[PDB]
Amino acid sequence: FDPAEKYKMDHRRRGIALIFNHERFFWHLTLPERRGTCADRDNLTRRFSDLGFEVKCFNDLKAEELLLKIHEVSTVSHADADCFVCVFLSHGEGNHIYAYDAKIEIQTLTGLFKGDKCHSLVGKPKIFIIQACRGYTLPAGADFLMCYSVAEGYYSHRETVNGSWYIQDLCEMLGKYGSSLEFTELLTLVNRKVSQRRVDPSAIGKKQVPCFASMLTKKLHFFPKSN
Amino acid sequence: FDPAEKYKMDHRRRGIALIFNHERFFWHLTLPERRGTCADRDNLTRRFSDLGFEVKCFNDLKAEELLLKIHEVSTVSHADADCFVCVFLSHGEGNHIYAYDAKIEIQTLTGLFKGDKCHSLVGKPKIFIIQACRGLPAGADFLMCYSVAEGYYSHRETVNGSWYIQDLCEMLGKYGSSLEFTELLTLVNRKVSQRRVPSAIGKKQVPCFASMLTKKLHFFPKSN
């Protein structure tokens, strides 16, 4: 038995990074919100591409080719891939319908990738990064890693023109440390950075604390892919 | 900014490790269950004591003096301590009342140690290890470790204890004083999920931990 066992990350491809933007049922689209969202998406696209991932982005605005894209990752073979990432982006304060729709969408997404339904990821890291939204975040399975921008209590800073604290901080760590540090050590750095930030704003003293929940059974590294 | 930053674990004392046994409302104390429970309690007492902790055990059978012991950790100062550990032990299948009671108890225990209520643990690791039972919000520097998942599958108690507790304690004993604590928990995920039972029972158990820690955590031998 080996305390330093890590996932085999020597497949032909890194795998897919699905970036899912939750937009339907949102209509307060102020400019900070719209500009922050695309920034977060762009920032994540670059960081994950640089880690070898094949990035696919889509949103839920059109309720017909969403299922397409959905079904479409459902049936994709991951035989030749190291792992799978899914990022769920949403806007900070939403109405109850927008928030309730997120919960169903996350429950659906995670359900698709359970060992029970995706044999080609059995034994491989299934990583979900969830930007939670305020108006059922209980998902799992072996080798899942669930990252949350904020824990169930809590306070999250609003979107800005440059994106959200959690996404910016995550991407900063990915770019600087992604290809070298163990992934959960990296997410721990993200806990610290985010929770250290602060808001003329009108609620001070407040902190956003991110959380990650690991059912991983080995260490996880994203060393540069090939030799 | 330092990728290797770790919690300062150089206080006078390691801190308290509270071992809480959820017993009330359980029916059907079979011998496996009763012997498993004390084994898990003994196993954890030795492992935590060896890591410097001041171990306190109690249960909910009685305790009018439960609140005593409760209030009593509530008001203890942890100024001279590195951290705080609470382990919540329960029996593997229980009735709905027993299970519902475990939820309230866990909500209450965790509630007590929030930065909002325990100033002397602010910025220190607050670690809850929960053996979940069948019929989650914490705070900065909380680490919640779960014998199982959500609802799922968990192996029943044996004479020697539960798989999760045995495997935890084995890792603690061998690696507790050297490895980063979430690395150790990851090893526990593997060990438990690799075990196999038989009747209707062909699956796994997969444990989970959820971290709001902001730094690496080690339990190196405290230098006396």
* DSSP one-letter string for A91-135: -SB--HHHHHHHHHHHHHHHHHHSTTT-GGGTTS-EEEEE---B-
Q: How many CB atoms lie within 10 A of CB A108?
A: 11
Distance CA A71, CA A60 (A): 14
**Inter-chain CB proximity B186 and A214 less than 8 Å:** yes
**Inter-chain CB proximity A189 and B3 less than 8 Å:** yes
- Residue B173: closest CA among B51, B11, B12: B51
φ, ψ at B32 (rounded to 5°): -45, -50
Rg (CA), chain B: 17
**Inter-chain CB proximity A184 and B182 less than 8 Å:** yes
- Residue A45: closest CA among A171, A133, A165: A171
Q: How many CB atoms lie within 10 A of CB A203?
A: 8
**Inter-chain CB proximity B136 and A141 less than 8 Å:** no
Specify the amino acid at residue B133: C
Distance CA A67, CA B88 (A): 42
Structural domains in chain A, CATH included, are 1-227 (3.40.50.1460)
Among A22, A83, A86, A91, which one carries the catalytic annotation?
A: A91
Residues of A in contact with B110 (CB under 8 A): none
**Secondary structure of residue B152 in the 3-state scheme:** coil
**Inter-chain CB proximity A195 and B214 less than 8 Å:** yes
Cross-strand bridge partners of residue B6 = B216
- Residue B1: closest CA among A140, A188, A150: A188
Provide the strand spans (E) within B11-97: 16-21, 54-59, 84-89
**Inter-chain CB proximity B183 and A3 less than 8 Å:** yes
Residues of A in contact with B191 (CB under 8 A): 1
φ, ψ at B144 (rounded to 5°): -110, 125
Distance CA A83, CA A52 (A): 11
- Residue B22: closest CA among B141, B109, B115, B122: B109
Q: Which two tokens stand for residue A120?
A: 């080609």
Nominal resolution (angstroms):
2.0
Q: Which two tokens stand for residue A51?
A: 């880690």
Best to test chain A binding among B128, B142, B212, B213 (most A CBs inside 10 Å)? B212
Distance CA B123, CA B79 (A): 11
Q: Which two tokens stand for residue B69?
A: 């012991």
Residues of B with CB under 8 A from a CB of A: 1, 3, 5, 136-140, 149-150, 152, 175, 179-180, 182-183, 185-187, 189-191, 193-194, 204, 206-216
For A187, nearest residue in chain B (alpha carbons): B214
- Residue A73: closest CA among A27, A110, A36, A33: A110
Among A133, A147, A157, A171, which one carries the catalytic annotation?
A: A133
- Nearest CA to CA, how far is A31 from chain B (Å)? 31
* Burial degree of A96 (CB within 10 A; 0-12, 13-18, 19+): exposed
Residues of A in contact with B183 (CB under 8 A): 3, 182, 219
**Secondary structure of residue A175 in the 3-state scheme:** helix
**Inter-chain CB proximity A215 and B207 less than 8 Å:** yes
CB B80 within 8 A of CB B13: yes
| Side-by-side strand order, sheet with A144-148 | A54-59, A16-21, A84-89, A126-130, A144-148, A211-214, B208-211, B142-146, B126-130, B84-89, B16-21, B54-59
Phi-psi bin for B52: left (phi > 0), alpha (psi -120 to 50), beta?
left
Q: How far is CA B72 from the centre of its chain?
A: 19
Specify the amino acid at residue A209: V
- Residue A15: closest CA among A140, A139, A143: A143
CB A49 within 8 A of CB A92: no
Q: Which two tokens stand for residue A143?
A: 């080798």
- Nearest CA to CA, how far is A21 from chain B (Å)? 25
Indicate the DSSP class of residue B146: E
Q: Which two tokens stand for residue B149?
A: 């998942």
Residues of B in contact with A216 (CB under 8 A): 186, 189
- Residue A147: closest CA among A52, A220, A51, A214: A214
Q: Which two tokens stand for residue B117?
A: 């209520």
Indicate the DSSP class of residue A78: -
Q: Are strands A144-148 and A126-130 parallel, antiparallel or unpaired?
A: parallel
- Residue B171: closest CA among B129, B216, B139, B212: B129
* Residues A223-227: contacts with CB under 8 Å, at least 24 apart: A223/A9, A223/A179, A223/A180, A224/A52, A224/A179, A225/A14, A225/A52
Of A3, A185, A188, the CB nearest to B187: A3
Distance CA A7, CA A126 (A): 12
Rg (CA), chain A: 17
Structure determined by: X-ray
Residues of B in contact with A5 (CB under 8 A): 190
- Residue A166: closest CA among A89, A81, A65: A89
**Inter-chain CB proximity A213 and B213 less than 8 Å:** no
Residues of A in contact with B152 (CB under 8 A): 140
Show Cβ contacts of residue A42 under 8 Å, excluding neighbours closer than 6 positions.
none
